[PDB]
Every structure is written in C-alpha cells, then in structure tokens.
From a paper:
The membrane proximal domain [name] (domain 10) is positioned perpendicular to the ring formed by domains 1 to 9, and the [name] C terminus points away from the plane of the ring. This out-of-the-ring orientation of [name] is observed in all five PlxnA ectodomain structures for which the electron density is sufficiently well ordered to allow [name] to be resolved. The same relative domain orientation recurs in the structure of PlxnA17-10. Possibly this distinctive orientation is stabilized by a loop (1,175–1,184) extending from [name] that provides hydrophobic interactions with three residues in domain IPT5, Trp1055, Ile1057, and Tyr1145, which are conserved across the A class Plxns. In the full-length plexin, the linker between [name] and the transmembrane helix is predicted to be short (6 residues for [name]), and thus, for this conformation, the plexin extracellular segment is most likely positioned close to the membrane with its ring parallel to the cell surface. The interface between PSI3 and [name] (domains 6 and 7) differs markedly from those of PSI1-IPT1 and PSI2-IPT2, imposing a more acute angle on the relative arrangement of these two domains, and thus reducing the ring circumference.
Residue numbers in the entry: 861 to 940, 944 to 1152, 1165 to 1209, 1218 to 1227
The structure:
Amino acid sequence: DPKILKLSPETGPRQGGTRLTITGENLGLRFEDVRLGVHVGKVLCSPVESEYISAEQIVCEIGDASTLRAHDALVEVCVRLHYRALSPKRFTFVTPTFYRVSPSRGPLSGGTWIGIEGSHLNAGSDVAVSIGGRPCSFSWRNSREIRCLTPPGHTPGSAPIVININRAQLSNPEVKYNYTEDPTILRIDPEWSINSGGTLLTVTGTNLATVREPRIRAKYGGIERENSCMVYNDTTMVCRAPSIDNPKRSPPELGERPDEIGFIMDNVRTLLVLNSSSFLYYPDPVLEPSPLILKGRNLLPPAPGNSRLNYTVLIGSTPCILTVSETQLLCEAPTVRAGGFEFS
Ligand SMILES: *[C@@H]1O[C@H](CO)[C@@H](O)[C@H](O)[C@H]1NC(C)=O
Ligand SMILES: *[C@@H]1O[C@H](CO)[C@@H](O)[C@H](O)[C@H]1NC(C)=O
Ligand SMILES: *[C@@H]1O[C@H](CO)[C@@H](O)[C@H](O)[C@H]1NC(C)=O
C-alpha cells in the first residue's frame, strides 16, 4: 500500500548528513508511524518531524556510510512493520573531489566568478565554499563544477580552497587561489566617443589580466550604460564605448563630459567612477541622402588630435576606401557605420 515516488537528491557524500527528501503515497499518518522505519540500505536515515508531510513526504538525515561495504542502496520505508515501501531507484554514496579552479587568480577586493571543477560536486543537500577561511558566495553547481563568487582577500598571495558538502570536507593543497593586487586605470585613448558609442578605446592600466571580463560603464542623462572589454595584457585592454543615446538629452557639438565614466572589474569598486577623467561624448554624425559624396556635419572631432571616427560605408556589404573631410565622405567603387552608429 505505501509507495515511494521520488528521492531527492539521488547522490550523497559517504560521510553522511544528506537531507534526503522522499516523496510518495501512503507514507504513514503521523510522524510516529515512520520515525524509526527509514533506512538507506544498512544506513539509518533519521526523519525530521518539522518537514514531515503526512502520507506524502519524509525528510530524513542520512547517517554515516564510511564503513558501508556498498556503493549504492535502495531506500526502505517501514510504516509502523509488514507494509513497507522500497524506493524505485537507488541512492548512490559518492566521494566528491575537485582538481581545478578557474580562474586561479583575482583581485584582492573579491567579486571574481570562479568555477571549481571536480567529480560528484552535485552530491548532498547543501554546499559551502571557503577561500582563506572566507565564504565564496555560492551561485550554482552540477556534477562537474561549482560556480561561486570570491570574497575579498586579507593579503595578496595563495589561499586554500575548502569545500563542505554535508559532513564531507573536501580539500586539495595543489588547488589554491592567488589573490592579486587590485588593477588600476591610468588613461583612455582616445579620450572621447560619439553618442551611439561602439568605438574602440585603448585603456591602459595595471594588473588588467587579473580580471577575466572587464566592462566599461558610463552614466549620462540619468541612465547607466555598459559595454564589453577584452584584455590584451596586464597593462593594455580594448573596450567599446558605451552608447549614451537617450531621449532626455544628447551631447552638444563641442562635447560634454558624461556624469560618470568608469569600469566594472569584479569588486574593485574604486574603478567604477573616474572622477578626474576628461572623457568627452560628441554627437553622432549627421548624414543625408563616378565618386559618391555623402555630405554632413559632426564628421570630424572639434578637437584635432591623433584620432578620428573610423568610418565604414558598407554599400554592397563591401567597404570602400574613403577620404573624410569636415563635410565629405567619398566612396570610389563601381550602410554607413561608425562604432555603434549606423545610417543610410
Ligand atoms: C600570484 O600571482 C603573481 C602575479 O600576479 C605571482 O607573481 C605570484 O607568484 C603568484 N602567487 C602564487 C602563490 O602563485
Ligand atoms: C601590452 O601590449 C601593448 C601593445 O603592443 C604594449 O604597448 C605594451 O607594452 C604591452 N605591455 C606589456 C606589459 O607587455
Ligand atoms: C576601421 O574599420 C575597418 C573596417 O572594419 C577596419 O578594417 C580597420 O581596422 C578599422 N581601423 C581602425 C583604426 O579601427
């Protein structure tokens, strides 16, 4: 008459402690009917009365299986002793391990998304990752990886990784996490972009390779906008300008500094806002509909330096070699792009 429908989870550490959840039918009436009749093979599973749902759910903590001479076992539930139910599938006792952390280094401020690779890392009912004794904020996990977020470090250098899965304490001295000095930002070249953004900016600083996915951010017109970067080496990365296009306002022809300009690099929050930055945003080009002469304004920057918009006229999906004046775009071939700007 009693029947088990599902077990969750299906694997657990051999040391025990797993909170097994047994869902079924006719699972007794009161907690006394099943308080002593739940076993995982030879191992006792102690039910928790607070999470016992009458005739439907039995939550029990699995005991120690360190001396059990078996790898998996069926779950037996005895109601009161004749009428008992056997689990449809088997519960597996495993020994979780890990062999790699990626990335193995990151800023001292923390905020680095790390994935610890190993075996049986999805076993049990809870998990807790620690680096140097501080909690790595758990995000998710499967059988081969645990994704968590590093905490701020005490001092730069290596730090041990310890994982807790119920009563199992996983360690590996060959797998450490190296806290590095926080990256710094020195200059942005060129120090300007257009309203639609999307232009390539060369950012130079220190320890840039210690952050896997740095981003660039700008606050303008009451709106925050972001864009992606790619690190080339510890002192040089390339970003795309955030687009500040919004219906509240647009930059003037002479340019205006954004309310904020900065970078998102893990939890190095001092880089979020560059206060003394003179970065300017300029208007988008204003074009209008056998050489072709596309006329318009805001084509060249009002500040003549070493840089100018890298235009591309994709007529026929083929770039044309072009000469650019203040009011001239010239194609010489037998749809207009500039960073994130596009117009025909
Ligand atoms: C941590 O990384 C730095 C380079 O950023 C390196 O010089 C140092 O040796 C590393 N520490 C360990 C323990 O690997
Ligand atoms: C990084 O690459 C840039 C581009 O050539 C170069 O100018 C710079 O010196 C490099 N920095 C290091 C630390 O290698
Ligand atoms: C300008 O755009 C063209 C077309 O994509 C590209 O080949 C070229 O490298 C770009 N130049 C610069 C300086 O970004």
